[PDB]
């Protein structure tokens, strides 16, 4: 055994999902400002622990 | 709108000069040409504007002020004698040759190979 003829099988047979066109991301001080407003301005404290930024349960 | 002031004025009995720093106040305008600066200094110091050599002008950020150097002369013969050749050529009263450095060095190393009066017969 030890077949080297099966290289890149998963990358070759995975189904190609095209990337979706999305909005522009603001950069620099603008990105730092929206990340400050998202964490220290608008959000309200949560019962018990806090909530993760990417939590999709 | 264009105003000129002088600073660090100092006469020079050594090169027969009067040397001063020119402060060119030109708000709202592009920086002022050297010939205009010469004639505006000439009216200020009561001297003919053909013996005045101004140079080295840097305008500050924001652009309300410009600092340079100026050197005015007692006579035009002395202005011809003890002045840089490039400032004389900027005035136009001097023309240097067009001749290169590379080809002049190559002609020198080509007349190095010959002896006697053949050094003038090398050229052309």
């Amino acid at each position: 055994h030890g077949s080297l003829a099966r290289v890149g099988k998963v990358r070759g047979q995975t189904l190609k999902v095209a990337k979706q066109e999305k909005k522009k991301k603001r950069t620099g001080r603008a990105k730092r400002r929206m990340q400050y407003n998202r964490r220290f301005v608008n959000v309200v404290p949560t019962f018990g622990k806090k909530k993760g930024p990417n939590a999709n349960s | 709108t264009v105003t000129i002031r002088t600073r660090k004025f100092m006469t020079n009995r050594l090169l027969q000069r009067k040397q001063m720093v020119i402060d060119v106040l030109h708000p709202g305008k592009a920086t002022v040409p050297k010939t205009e600066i010469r004639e505006k200094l000439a009216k200020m110091y009561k001297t003919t504007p053909d013996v005045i050599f101004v140079f080295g002008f840097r305008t500050h950020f924001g652009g309300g002020k410009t600092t340079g150097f100026g050197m005015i002369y007692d006579s035009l013969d002395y202005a011809k004698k003890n002045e840089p050749k490039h400032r004389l050529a900027r005035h136009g009263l001097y023309e240097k040759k067009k001749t290169s450095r590379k080809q002049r060095k190559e002609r020198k190393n080509r007349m190095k190979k010959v002896r006697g009066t053949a050094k003038a017969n090398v050229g052309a």
Binding site: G2, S3, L4, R6, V7, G8, V10, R11, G12 | -
Partner: protein, 141 residues
């Protein structure tokens, strides 16, 4: 320190100097034989010629066929085995081709699943394998 006296600087210095050679990280760095057995010779990278595209079986529990390359270096003539890192990247490397080979990160130590391989491939035919993986530059032919 155990001897403490005012005239014991010689004893302290000579003892510390002699006890440096029992340090593994000092002896490897300050004896030449490690650098002689090093296939790179103190170099961070080396260019080599691909002799073979080989399949190295991985170790215990992790079971895979790692896709490595038998390379012959140019500065030495010495044959090493380097790792072709990502998925499908052995197609972008051909036999009899010139690669740029770096270490893998543990400074002449076999890393992770792989027996003995302490080298990896960063470029092939003067175009990088990361660019060929991401599709930024194609393989010239």
């Amino acid at each position: 320190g155990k001897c403490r006296g005012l005239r014991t600087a010689r004893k302290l210095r000579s003892h510390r100097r002699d006890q440096k050679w029992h340090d593994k990280q000092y002896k490897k760095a300050h004896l030449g034989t490690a650098l002689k057995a090093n296939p790179f010779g103190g170099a961070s990278h080396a260019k080599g010629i691909v002799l073979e595209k080989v399949g190295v079986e991985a170790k215990q529990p992790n079971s895979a066929i790692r896709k490595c390359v038998r390379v012959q270096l140019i500065k030495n003539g010495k044959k090493i085995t380097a790792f072709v890192p990502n998925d499908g990247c052995l197609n972008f490397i051909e036999e009899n081709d010139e690669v740029l080979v770096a270490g893998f990160g543990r400074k002449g130590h076999a890393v992770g699943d792989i027996p003995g391989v302490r080298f990896k491939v960063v470029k092939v035919a003067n175009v990088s394998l990361l660019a060929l993986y991401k599709g930024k530059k194609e393989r010239p032919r």
